[PDB]
Swiss-Prot record, chains A, B:
It is an enzyme of class 3 (hydrolase). It catalyses: N(omega)-phospho-L-arginyl-[protein] + H2O = L-arginyl-[protein] + phosphate. This is Protein-arginine-phosphatase. Belongs to the low molecular weight phosphotyrosine protein phosphatase family. The active site is at C8, R14, D116. Keywords: Hydrolase, Protein phosphatase. Catalyzes the specific dephosphorylation of phosphoarginine residues in proteins. Probably counteracts the protein arginine kinase McsB in vivo. Exhibits almost no activity against pTyr peptides. Protein arginine phosphorylation has a physiologically important role and is involved in the regulation of many critical cellular processes, such as protein homeostasis, motility, competence, and stringent and stress responses, by regulating gene expression and protein activity. Therefore, this novel tool for the selective enrichment and subsequent MS analysis of arginine phosphorylation should facilitate the investigation of this highly overlooked protein modification, in particular in eukaryotic samples. PANTHER family: LOW MOLECULAR WEIGHT PROTEIN TYROSINE PHOSPHATASE, LOW MOLECULAR WEIGHT PROTEIN-TYROSINE-PHOSPHATASE ETP-RELATED. It comes from Geobacillus stearothermophilus. Its EC number is 3.9.1.2. It comes from the Bacteria.
């Protein structure tokens, strides 16, 4: 059972898009949340994030969350948008070091950041969305391959 | 009256040193706190921070605090250790924009970050302390000059 936690700073732009894209796939045995390292409670996803998600048929009704101990304990995998987020999470919650990765490194094996679209025009959000969708597709394939490989019982 | 809030990330290293240096002066009409953008509650200042403070005769109690709305509303001035911290504070708490500065910009008019030890050797903690001592001396002079200039009546 996977519990995937996507993390950025404000939990209004990158991580809600990552979460919405993964949740949209409705993968069995996968649960999805997002949170921000420094975020308000109950804020909507930003308007450009909502718009570019709508282009893909997604209307997630996101509400922002501050990243807390409870989320860290819940997660099987904490997938940070950038190496800076990863570093902050591990410093704040050292007990999470074994399960905290950047999204790019977890799915590709190679270090990389998802660029922050905040403050940018819609095409900058669409670029972030496209990068995220590719990574989430690869993530989905990774998880399901593992699930199938280790499936037993009847 | 002045309510000075020093801010870093973990509130164990730079901001507690800043707070301790200013509090040690016991300036009339000045209250001092510190908090961290992403910090645990109740942690001691780090050992090297305590050591370099001890070298200057300071052995103050510190308990780490997560930066919250309440600290922002309390402060007359939010003095960040770095521009990165300033930017995070203003993005998270837009209502704080007029009163949030880096310590360097507030006392010198140019910008700069306080040296980051990265939990490293005592020598870098000492370098940070020395930078802070210089800036906090200037801060003291700035506040007291204002207080004296606008002092009226018995």
């Amino acid at each position: 059972p996977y519990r995937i936690l996507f993390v950025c700073t404000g939990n209004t732009c990158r991580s809600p898009m990552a979460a919405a894209l993964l949740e949209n796939k409705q993968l069995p045995g996968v649960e999805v949340k997002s949170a921000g390292v420094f975020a308000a409670e109950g804020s909507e996803a930003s308007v450009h994030a909502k718009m570019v998600l709508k282009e893909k048929g997604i209307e997630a009704a996101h509400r922002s969350s501050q990243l807390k101990k409870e989320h860290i304990d819940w997660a099987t995998h904490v997938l940070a948008m950038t190496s800076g987020h990863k570093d902050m999470i591990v410093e704040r919650f050292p007990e999470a070091k074994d399960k905290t990765f950047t999204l790019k490194q977890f799915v590709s094996g190679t270090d990389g950041d998802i660029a922050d679209p905040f403050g940018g025009p819609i095409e900058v959000y669409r670029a972030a969305r496209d990068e995220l969708e590719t990574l989430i597709d690869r993530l989905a394939e990774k998880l399901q391959t593992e699930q199938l490989e280790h499936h037993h019982h009847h």
